[PDB]
PDB file of C-alpha atoms and ligand atoms in Angstrom:
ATOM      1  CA  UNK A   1       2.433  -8.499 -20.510  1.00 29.79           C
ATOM      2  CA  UNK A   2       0.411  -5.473 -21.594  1.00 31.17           C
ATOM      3  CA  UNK A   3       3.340  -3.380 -20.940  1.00 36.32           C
ATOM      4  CA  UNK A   4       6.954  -3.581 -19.164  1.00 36.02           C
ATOM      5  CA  UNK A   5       7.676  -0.721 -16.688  1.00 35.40           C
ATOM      6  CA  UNK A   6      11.186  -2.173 -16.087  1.00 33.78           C
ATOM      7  CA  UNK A   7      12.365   1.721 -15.769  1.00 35.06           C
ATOM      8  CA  UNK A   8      12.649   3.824 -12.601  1.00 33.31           C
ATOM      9  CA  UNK A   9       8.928   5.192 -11.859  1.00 29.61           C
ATOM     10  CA  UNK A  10       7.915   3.231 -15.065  1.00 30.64           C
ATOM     11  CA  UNK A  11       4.417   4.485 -15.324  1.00 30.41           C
ATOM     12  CA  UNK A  12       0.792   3.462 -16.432  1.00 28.70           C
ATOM     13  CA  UNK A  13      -2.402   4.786 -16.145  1.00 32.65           C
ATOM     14  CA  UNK A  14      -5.594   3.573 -16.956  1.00 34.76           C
ATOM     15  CA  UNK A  15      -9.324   2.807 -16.563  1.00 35.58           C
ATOM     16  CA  UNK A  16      -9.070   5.595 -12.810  1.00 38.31           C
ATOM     17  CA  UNK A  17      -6.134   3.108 -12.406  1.00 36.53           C
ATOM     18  CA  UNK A  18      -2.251   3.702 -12.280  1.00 39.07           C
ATOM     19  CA  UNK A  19       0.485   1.192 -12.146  1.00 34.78           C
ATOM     20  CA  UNK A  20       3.932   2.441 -11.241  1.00 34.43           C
ATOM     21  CA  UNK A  21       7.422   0.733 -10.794  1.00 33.57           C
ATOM     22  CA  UNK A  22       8.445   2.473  -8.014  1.00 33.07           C
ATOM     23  CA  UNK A  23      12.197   1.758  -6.519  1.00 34.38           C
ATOM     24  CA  UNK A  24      12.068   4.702  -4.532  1.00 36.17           C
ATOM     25  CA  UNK A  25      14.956   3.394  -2.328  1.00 34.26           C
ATOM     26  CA  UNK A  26      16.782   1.367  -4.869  1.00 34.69           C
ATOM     27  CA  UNK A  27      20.111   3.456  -4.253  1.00 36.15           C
ATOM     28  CA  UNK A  28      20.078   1.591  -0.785  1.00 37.92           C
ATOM     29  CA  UNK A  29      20.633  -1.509  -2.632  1.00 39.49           C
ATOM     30  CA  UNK A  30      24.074  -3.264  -3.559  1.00 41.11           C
ATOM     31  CA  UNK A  31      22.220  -5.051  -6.503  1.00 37.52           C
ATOM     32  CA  UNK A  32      19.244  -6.071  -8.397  1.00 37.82           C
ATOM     33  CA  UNK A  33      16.464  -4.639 -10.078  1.00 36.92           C
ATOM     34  CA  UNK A  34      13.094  -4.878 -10.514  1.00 38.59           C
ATOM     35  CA  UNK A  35      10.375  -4.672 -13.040  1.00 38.44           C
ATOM     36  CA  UNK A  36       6.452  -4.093 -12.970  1.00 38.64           C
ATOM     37  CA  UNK A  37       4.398  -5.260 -15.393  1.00 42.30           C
ATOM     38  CA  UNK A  38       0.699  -4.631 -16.835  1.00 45.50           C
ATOM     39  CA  UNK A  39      -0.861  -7.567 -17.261  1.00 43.99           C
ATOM     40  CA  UNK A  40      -4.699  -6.963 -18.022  1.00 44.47           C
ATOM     41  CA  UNK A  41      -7.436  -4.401 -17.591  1.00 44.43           C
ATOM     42  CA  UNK A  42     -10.548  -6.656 -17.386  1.00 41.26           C
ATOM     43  CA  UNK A  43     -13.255  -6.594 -15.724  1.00 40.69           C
ATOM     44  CA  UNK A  44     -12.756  -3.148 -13.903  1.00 41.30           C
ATOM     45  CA  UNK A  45     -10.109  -4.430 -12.378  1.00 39.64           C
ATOM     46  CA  UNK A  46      -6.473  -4.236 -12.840  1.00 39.21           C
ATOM     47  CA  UNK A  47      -3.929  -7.566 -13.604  1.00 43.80           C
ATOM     48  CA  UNK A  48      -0.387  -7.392 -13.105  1.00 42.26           C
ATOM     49  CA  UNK A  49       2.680  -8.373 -11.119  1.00 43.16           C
ATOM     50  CA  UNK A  50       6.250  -7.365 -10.500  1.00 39.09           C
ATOM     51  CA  UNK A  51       9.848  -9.226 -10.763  1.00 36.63           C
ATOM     52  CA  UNK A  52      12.434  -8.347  -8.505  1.00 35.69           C
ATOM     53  CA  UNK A  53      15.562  -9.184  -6.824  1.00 29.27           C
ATOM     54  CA  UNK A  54      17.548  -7.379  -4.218  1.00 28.33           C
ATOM     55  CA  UNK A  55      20.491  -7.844  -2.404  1.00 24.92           C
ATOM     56  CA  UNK A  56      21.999  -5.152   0.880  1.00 25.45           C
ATOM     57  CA  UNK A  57      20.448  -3.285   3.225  1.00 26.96           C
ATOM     58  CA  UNK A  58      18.164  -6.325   4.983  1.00 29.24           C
ATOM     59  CA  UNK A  59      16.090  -3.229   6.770  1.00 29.18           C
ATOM     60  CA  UNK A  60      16.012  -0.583   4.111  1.00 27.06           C
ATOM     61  CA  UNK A  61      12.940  -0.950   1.646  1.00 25.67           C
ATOM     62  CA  UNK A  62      14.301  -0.809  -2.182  1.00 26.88           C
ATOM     63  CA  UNK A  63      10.652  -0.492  -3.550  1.00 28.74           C
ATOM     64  CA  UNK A  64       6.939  -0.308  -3.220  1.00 28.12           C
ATOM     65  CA  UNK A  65       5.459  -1.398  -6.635  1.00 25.30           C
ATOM     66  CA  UNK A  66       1.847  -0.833  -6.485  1.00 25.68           C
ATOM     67  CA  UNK A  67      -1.549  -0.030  -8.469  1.00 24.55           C
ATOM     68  CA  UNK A  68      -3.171   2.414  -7.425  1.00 23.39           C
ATOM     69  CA  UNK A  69      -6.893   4.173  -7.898  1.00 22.97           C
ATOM     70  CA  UNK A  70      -6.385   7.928  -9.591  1.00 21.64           C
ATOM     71  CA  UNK A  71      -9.288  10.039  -7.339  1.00 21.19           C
ATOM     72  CA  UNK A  72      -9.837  13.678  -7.452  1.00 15.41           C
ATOM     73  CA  UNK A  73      -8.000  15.960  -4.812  1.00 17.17           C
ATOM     74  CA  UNK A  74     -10.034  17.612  -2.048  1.00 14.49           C
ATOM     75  CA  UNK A  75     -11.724  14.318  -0.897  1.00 15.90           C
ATOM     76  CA  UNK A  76     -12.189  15.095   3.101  1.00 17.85           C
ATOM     77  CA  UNK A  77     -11.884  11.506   4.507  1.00 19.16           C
ATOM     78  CA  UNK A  78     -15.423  12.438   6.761  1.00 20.37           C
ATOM     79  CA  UNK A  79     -17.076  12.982   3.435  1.00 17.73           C
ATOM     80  CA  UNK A  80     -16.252   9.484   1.909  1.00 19.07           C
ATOM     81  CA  UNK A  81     -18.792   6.992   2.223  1.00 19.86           C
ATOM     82  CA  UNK A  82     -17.051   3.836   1.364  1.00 20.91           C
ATOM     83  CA  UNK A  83     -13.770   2.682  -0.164  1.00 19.83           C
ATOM     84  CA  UNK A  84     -14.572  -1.118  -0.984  1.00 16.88           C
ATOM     85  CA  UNK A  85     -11.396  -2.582  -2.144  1.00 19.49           C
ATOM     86  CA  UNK A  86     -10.390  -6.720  -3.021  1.00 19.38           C
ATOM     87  CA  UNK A  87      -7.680  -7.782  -4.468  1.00 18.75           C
ATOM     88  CA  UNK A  88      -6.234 -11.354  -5.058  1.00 18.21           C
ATOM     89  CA  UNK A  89      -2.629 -11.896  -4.936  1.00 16.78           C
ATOM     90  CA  UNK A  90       0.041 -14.681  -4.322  1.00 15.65           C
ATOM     91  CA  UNK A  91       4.134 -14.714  -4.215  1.00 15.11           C
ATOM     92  CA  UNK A  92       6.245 -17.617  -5.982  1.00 12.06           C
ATOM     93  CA  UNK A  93       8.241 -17.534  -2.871  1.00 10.14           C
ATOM     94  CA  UNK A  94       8.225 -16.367   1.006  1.00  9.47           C
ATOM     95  CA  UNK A  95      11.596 -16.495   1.985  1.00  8.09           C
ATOM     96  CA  UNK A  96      12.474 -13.546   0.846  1.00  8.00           C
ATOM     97  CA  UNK A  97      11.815 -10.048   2.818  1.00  5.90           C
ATOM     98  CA  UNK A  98       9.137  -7.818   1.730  1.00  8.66           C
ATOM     99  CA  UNK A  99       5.283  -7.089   2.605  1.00  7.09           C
ATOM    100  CA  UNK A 100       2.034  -6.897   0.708  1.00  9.39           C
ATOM    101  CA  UNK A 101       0.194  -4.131   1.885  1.00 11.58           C
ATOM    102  CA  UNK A 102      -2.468  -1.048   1.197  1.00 15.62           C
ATOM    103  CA  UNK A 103      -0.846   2.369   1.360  1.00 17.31           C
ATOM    104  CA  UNK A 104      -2.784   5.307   2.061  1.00 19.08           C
ATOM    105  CA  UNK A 105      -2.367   9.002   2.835  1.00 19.63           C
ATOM    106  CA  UNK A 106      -3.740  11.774   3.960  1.00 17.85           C
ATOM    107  CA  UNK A 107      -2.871  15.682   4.611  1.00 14.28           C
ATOM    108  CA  UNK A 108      -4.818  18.681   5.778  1.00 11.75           C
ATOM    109  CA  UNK A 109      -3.120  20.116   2.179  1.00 17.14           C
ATOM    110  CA  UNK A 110      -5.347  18.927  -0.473  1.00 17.72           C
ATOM    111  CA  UNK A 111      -2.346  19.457  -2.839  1.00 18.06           C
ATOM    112  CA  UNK A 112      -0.013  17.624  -1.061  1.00 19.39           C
ATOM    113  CA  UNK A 113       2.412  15.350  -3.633  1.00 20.04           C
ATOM    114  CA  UNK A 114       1.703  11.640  -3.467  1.00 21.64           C
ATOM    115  CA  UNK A 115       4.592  10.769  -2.077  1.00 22.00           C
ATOM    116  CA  UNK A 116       3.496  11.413   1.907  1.00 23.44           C
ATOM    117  CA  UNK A 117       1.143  13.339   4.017  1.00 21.04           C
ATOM    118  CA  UNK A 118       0.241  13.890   7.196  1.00 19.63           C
ATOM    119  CA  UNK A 119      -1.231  10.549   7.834  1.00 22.73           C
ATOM    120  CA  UNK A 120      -0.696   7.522   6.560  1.00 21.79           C
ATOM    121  CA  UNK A 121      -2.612   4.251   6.797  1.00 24.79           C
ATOM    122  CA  UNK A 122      -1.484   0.850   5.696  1.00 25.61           C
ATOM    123  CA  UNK A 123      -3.236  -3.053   5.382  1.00 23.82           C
ATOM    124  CA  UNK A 124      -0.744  -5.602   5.564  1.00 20.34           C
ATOM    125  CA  UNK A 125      -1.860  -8.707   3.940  1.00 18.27           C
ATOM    126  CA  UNK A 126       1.633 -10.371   4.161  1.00 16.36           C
ATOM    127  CA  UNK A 127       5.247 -10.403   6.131  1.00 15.80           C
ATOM    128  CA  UNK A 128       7.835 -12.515   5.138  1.00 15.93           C
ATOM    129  CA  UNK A 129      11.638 -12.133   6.232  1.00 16.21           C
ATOM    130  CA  UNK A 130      11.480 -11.156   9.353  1.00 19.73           C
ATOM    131  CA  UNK A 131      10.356  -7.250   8.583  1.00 18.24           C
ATOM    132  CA  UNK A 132       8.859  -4.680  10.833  1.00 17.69           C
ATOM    133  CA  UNK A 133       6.372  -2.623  10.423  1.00 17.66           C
ATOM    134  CA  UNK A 134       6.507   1.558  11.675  1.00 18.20           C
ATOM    135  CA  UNK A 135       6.018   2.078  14.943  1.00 18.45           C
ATOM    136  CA  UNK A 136       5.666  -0.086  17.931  1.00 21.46           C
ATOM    137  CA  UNK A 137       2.647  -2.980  18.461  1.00 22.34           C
ATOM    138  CA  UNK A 138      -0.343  -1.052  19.933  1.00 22.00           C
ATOM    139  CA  UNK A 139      -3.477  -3.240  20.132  1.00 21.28           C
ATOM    140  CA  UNK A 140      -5.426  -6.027  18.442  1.00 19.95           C
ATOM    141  CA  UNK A 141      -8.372  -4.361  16.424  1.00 21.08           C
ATOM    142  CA  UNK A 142     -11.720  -5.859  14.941  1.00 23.51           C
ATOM    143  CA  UNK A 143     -12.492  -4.737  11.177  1.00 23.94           C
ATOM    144  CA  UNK A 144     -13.598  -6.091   7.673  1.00 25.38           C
ATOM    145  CA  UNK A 145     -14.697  -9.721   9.820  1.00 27.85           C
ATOM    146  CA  UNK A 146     -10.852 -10.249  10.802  1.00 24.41           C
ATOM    147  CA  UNK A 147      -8.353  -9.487  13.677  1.00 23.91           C
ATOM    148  CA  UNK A 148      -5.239  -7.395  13.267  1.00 25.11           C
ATOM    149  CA  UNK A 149      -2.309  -5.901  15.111  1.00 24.86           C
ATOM    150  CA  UNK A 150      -2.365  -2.390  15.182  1.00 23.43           C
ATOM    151  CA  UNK A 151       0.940  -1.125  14.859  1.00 25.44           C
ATOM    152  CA  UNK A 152       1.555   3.046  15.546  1.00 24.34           C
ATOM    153  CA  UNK A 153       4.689   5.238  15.171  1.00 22.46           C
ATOM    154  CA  UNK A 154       5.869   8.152  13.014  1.00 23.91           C
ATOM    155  CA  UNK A 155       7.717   8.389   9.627  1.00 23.92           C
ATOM    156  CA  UNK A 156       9.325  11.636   9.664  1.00 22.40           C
ATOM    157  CA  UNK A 157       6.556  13.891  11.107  1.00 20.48           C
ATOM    158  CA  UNK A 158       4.041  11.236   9.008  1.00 20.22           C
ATOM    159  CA  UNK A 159       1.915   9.440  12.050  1.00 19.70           C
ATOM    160  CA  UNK A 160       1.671   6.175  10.675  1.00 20.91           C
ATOM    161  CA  UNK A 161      -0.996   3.472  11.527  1.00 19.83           C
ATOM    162  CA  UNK A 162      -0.362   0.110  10.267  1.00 18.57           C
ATOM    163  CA  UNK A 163      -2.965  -3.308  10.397  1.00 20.75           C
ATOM    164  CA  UNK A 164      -1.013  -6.258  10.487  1.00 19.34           C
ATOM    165  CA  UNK A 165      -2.178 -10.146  10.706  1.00 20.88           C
ATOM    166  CA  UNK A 166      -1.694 -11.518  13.792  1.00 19.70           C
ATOM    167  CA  UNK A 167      -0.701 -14.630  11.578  1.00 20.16           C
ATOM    168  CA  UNK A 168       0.025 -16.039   8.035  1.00 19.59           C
ATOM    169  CA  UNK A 169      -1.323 -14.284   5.293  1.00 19.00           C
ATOM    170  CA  UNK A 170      -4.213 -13.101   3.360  1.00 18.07           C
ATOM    171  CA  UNK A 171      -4.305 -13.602  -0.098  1.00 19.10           C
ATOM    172  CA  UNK A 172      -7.729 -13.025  -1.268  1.00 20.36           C
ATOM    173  CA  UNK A 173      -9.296  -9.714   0.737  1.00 19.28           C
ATOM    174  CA  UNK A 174     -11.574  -7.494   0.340  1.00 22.25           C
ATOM    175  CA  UNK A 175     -12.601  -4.620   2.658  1.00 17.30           C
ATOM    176  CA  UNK A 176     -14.241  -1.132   3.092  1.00 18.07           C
ATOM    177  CA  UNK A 177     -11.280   1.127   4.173  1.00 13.00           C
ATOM    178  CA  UNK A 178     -13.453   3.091   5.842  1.00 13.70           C
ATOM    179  CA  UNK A 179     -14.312   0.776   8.223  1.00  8.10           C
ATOM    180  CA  UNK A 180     -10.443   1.553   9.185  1.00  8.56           C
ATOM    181  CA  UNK A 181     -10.569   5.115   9.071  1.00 12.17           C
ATOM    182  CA  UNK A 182     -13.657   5.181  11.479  1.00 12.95           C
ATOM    183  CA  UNK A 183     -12.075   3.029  13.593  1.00 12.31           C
ATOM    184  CA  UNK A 184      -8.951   5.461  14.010  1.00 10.83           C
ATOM    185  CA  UNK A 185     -11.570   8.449  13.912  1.00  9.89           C
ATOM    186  CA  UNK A 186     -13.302   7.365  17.060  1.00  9.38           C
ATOM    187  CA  UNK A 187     -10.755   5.860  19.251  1.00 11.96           C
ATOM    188  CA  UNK A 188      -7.316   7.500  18.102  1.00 11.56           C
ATOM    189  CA  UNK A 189      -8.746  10.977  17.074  1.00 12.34           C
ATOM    190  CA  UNK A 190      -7.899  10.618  13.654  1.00 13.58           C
ATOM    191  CA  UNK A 191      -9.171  14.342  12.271  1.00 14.65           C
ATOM    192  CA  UNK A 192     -10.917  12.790   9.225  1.00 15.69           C
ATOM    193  CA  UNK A 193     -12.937  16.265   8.637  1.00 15.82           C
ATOM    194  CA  UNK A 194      -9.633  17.847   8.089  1.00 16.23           C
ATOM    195  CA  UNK A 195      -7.624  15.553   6.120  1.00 14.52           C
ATOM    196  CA  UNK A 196      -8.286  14.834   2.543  1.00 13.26           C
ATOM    197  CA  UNK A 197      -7.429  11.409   0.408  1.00 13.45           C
ATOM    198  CA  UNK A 198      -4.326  11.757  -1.193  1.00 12.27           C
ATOM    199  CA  UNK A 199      -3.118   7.560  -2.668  1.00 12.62           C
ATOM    200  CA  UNK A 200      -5.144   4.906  -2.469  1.00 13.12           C
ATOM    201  CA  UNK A 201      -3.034   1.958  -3.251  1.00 13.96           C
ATOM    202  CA  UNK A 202      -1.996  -1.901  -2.681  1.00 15.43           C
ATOM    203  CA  UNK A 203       1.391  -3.149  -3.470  1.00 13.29           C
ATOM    204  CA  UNK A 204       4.343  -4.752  -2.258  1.00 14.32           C
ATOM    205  CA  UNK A 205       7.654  -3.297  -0.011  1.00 14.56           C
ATOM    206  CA  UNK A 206      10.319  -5.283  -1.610  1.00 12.55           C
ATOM    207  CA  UNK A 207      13.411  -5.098   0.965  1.00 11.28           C
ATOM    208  CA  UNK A 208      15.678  -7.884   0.015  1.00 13.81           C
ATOM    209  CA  UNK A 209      15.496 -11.239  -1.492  1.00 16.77           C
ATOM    210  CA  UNK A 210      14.924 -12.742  -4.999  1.00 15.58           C
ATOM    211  CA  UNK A 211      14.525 -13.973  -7.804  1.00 17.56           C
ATOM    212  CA  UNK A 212      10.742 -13.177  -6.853  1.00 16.35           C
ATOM    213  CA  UNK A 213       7.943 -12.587  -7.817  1.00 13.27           C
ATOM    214  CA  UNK A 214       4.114 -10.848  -6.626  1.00 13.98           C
ATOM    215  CA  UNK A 215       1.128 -11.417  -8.874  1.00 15.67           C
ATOM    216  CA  UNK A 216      -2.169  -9.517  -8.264  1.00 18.06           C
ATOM    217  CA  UNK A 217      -4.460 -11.765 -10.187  1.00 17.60           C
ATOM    218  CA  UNK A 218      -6.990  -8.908  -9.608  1.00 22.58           C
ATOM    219  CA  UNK A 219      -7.734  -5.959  -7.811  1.00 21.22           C
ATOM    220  CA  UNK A 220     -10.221  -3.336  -7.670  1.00 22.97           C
ATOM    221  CA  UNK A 221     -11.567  -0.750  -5.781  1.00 21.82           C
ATOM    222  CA  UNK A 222     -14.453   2.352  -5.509  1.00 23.57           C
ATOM    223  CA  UNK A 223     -14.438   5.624  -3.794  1.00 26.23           C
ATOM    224  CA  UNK A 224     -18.129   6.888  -3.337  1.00 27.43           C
TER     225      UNK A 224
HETATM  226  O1  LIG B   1       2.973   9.284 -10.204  1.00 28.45           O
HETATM  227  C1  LIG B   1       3.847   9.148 -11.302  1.00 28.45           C
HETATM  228  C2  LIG B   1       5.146   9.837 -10.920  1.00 28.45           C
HETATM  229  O2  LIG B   1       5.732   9.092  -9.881  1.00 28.45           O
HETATM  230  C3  LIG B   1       6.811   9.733  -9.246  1.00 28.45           C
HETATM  231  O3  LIG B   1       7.376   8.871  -8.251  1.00 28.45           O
HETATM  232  C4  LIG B   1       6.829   8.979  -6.944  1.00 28.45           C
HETATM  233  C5  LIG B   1       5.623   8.047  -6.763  1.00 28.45           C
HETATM  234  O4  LIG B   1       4.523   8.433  -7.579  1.00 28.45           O
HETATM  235  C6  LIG B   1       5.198   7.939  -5.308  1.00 28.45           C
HETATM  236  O5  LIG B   1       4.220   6.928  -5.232  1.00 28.45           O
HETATM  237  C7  LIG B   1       6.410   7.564  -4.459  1.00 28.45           C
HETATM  238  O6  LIG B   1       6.051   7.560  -3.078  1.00 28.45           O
HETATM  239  C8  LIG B   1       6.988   6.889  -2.240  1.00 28.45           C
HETATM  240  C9  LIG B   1       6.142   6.053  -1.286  1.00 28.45           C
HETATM  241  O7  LIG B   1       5.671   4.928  -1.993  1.00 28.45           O
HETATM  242  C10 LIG B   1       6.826   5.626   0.019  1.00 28.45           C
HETATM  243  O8  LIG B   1       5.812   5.122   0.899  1.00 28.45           O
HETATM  244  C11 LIG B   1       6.351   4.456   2.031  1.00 28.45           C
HETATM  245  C12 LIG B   1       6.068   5.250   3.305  1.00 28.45           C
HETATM  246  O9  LIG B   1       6.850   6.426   3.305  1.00 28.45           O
HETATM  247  C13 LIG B   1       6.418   4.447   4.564  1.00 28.45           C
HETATM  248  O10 LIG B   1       6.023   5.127   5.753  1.00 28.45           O
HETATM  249  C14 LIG B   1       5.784   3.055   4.539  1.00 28.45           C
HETATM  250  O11 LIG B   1       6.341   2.266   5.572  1.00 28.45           O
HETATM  251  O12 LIG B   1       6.068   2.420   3.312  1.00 28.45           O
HETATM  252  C15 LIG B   1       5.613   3.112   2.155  1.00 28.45           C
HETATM  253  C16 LIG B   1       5.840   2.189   0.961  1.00 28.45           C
HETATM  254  O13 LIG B   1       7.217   1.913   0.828  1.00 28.45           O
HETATM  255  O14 LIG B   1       7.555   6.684   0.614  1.00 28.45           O
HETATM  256  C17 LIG B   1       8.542   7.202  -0.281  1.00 28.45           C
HETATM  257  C18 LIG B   1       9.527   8.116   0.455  1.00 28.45           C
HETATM  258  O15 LIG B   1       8.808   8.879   1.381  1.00 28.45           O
HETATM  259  C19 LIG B   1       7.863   7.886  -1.466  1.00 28.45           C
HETATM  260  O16 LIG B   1       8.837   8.449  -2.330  1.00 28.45           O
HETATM  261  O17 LIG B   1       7.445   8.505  -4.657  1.00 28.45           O
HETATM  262  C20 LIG B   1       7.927   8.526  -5.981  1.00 28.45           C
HETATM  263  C21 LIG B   1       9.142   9.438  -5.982  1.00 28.45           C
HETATM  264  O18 LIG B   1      10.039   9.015  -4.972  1.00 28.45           O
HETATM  265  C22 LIG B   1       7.911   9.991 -10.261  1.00 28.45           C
HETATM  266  O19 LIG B   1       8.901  10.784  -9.639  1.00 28.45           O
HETATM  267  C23 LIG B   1       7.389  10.663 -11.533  1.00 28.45           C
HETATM  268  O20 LIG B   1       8.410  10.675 -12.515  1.00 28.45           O
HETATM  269  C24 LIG B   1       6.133   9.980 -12.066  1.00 28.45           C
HETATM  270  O21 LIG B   1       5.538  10.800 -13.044  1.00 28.45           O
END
């Protein structure tokens, strides 16, 4: 590796990427730990993967390692064009319980820290273990040339949409995120003209399980 975040928040940045080791609920945990590493830059992409093991607290997420694309603040999510993402990923195990998934907020406060918003949207592209997403299942939903379960609920006063696969997993992807925020726009009356891009991210929700570990062979993504 590049670099070892093994540290709490252990933190990169890079290339309009970051990369940060993020055990946000790790003191819901009896034991383990967990490290991200940086494994390349190439190609305008980012490389790298993340070690972990966790045992207590089966429904309690210890972490959400991800990469994610720095963009400037004040972004209204009407006034973005596109956000074409792919990344390519695989797990040494699945019997283990934890997600992969894009993580996205949004907030009518520009400003608003990165850790919430007002709205958040995620793309699962895994569940193993038996997890569940936020929220209740809504409908099945159309976008980027696959189906998915919509799942909707609330996070604290967060509305939370989540895309799920109505099966398996998806370990190569690549989509314009847009596509989902349209989608929400015109049938779930997202306000996109008042909320503005806060994270833009992919990573993993680590709950329990281990020794594991997620490897994002590549991933990349544009904001115009
Ligand atoms: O940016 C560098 C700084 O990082 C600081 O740590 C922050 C971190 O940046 C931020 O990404 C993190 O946010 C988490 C968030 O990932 C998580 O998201 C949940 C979501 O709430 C939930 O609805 C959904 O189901 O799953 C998501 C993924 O698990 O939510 C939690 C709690 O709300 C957020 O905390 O938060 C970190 C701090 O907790 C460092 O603090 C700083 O030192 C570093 O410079």
């Amino acid at each position: 590796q590049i670099r070892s975040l093994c540290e709490l928040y252990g933190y990169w940045s890079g290339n309009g990427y970051e990369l940060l080791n993020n055990l946000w609920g790790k003191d819901t945990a009896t034991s383990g730990w967990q490290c991200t590493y940086l494994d390349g830059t190439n190609n305008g992409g980012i490389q790298w993967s993340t070690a972990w093991e966790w045992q207590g607290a089966p429904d309690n997420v210890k972490s959400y390692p991800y990469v994610g694309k720095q963009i400037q603040r004040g972004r209204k999510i009407s006034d973005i064009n596109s956000m074409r993402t792919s990344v390519s990923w695989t797990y040494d195990r699945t019997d283990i319980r934890a997600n992969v998934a894009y993580d996205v907020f949004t907030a009518r406060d520009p400003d608003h820290p990165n850790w919430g918003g007002d709205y958040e949207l995620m793309i699962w592209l895994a569940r193993y273990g038996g997890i569940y997403p936020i929220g209740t299942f809504h409908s099945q939903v159309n976008l980027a040339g696959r189906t998915w379960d919509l799942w909707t609920g609330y996070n604290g006063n967060m509305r939370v949409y989540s895309f799920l696969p109505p099966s398996g997993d998806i370990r190569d992807f690549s989509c314009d995120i847009k596509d989902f925020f349209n989608y929400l726009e015109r049938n779930h009356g997202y306000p996109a003209r008042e909320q503005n891009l806060i994270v833009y991210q992919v990573g993993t929700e680590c709950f329990t399980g281990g020794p594991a570990r997620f490897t994002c062979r590549d991933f990349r993504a544009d904001l115009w």
